Symmetry: C2
Subunit: 168 residues, 2 copies
């Protein structure tokens, strides 16, 4: 349904532009940090803006250097990404570039706006469909090769979730 389009949009408008240059940006910063972009997909579409206050064991460290380009008439559109440390029992246990898949917010907001024709009951299904479509896209995308990881989850810890994947 709507999720198919937002997944394709997430790829075309973002992932395919930044993933090719992401390893370049991460070496420039080391000049410690995983070489993948970790993408959080909460299946209830509960996407906070402040990630550090969503789990005390996730902590903002720094921004990667910016990637800019002219895009659809906007001069120097800016793609920035944030680096986080992940704590476990008061120890720095991992560091990575981490974010939520923003289009899940669109799913959320559409579910609240009556004009959008999208019930609040359909949110989980659309999130699943979005996750599936994005998986299918990335499995076959040349810009992805390592490069990034989808972390999908459903809340009945986040930092432990992320840390598992970082484990080897």
């Amino acid at each position: 349904n709507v999720a198919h389009g937002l997944a394709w949009s997430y790829y075309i408008g973002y992932l395919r532009l930044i993933l090719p240059e992401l390893q370049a940006r991460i070496r420039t910063y080391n000049q410690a940090v995983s070489q993948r972009l970790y993408i959080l997909l909460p299946l209830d579409c509960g996407v906070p803006d402040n990630l550090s206050m969503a789990d005390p064991n996730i902590r903002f460290l720094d921004k990667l250097p910016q990637q800019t380009g002219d895009r659809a008439g906007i001069k120097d559109r800016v793609y920035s990404n944030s680096i986080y440390e992940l704590l476990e029992n008061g120890q720095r246990a991992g560091t990575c570039v981490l974010e939520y898949a923003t289009p899940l917010q669109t799913l959320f907001a559409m579910s609240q706006y009556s004009q959008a024709g999208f019930s609040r009951e359909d949110r989980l299904e659309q999130a699943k469909l979005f996750c599936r479509t994005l998986e299918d896209i990335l499995a076959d995308a040349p810009e992805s090769q390592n490069n990034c990881r989808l972390i999908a989850y459903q809340e009945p810890s986040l930092s432990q979730e992320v840390l598992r994947h970082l484990r080897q």
Copy 2:
């Protein structure tokens, strides 16, 4: 179809965030420029990145001051907008903040990728549907009140098109 979602995404992820603060940003720059954001919707989804080399009478002048915020785990996501001058017979005839509706690029790219399930013949219909949905959204959106203008068009001059709207 896919256009409904991208229009809603364009609203939720962008227009509703920047239009409330756009007049503030335009006064800060005058510190001449129209008080609306002009959005180009070419119905063939031919969206260049460099607008100044799409018409010699459209010329980049400057960026508005940036609007930043934490968004889905990214610290200080940046919304910038470009100001253009519009020429007519070698005279500065108008100045405004101007851009293309980027999601039309997604429509284009989806039409080229076989995995996306979207024929190249469906591009114009989806663009029309996107334009219609965005119109319906903005007619009723509180964040829009003046604030912005959609300029939809189908190429068989761009600057004259824009200039008509700027006329009164």
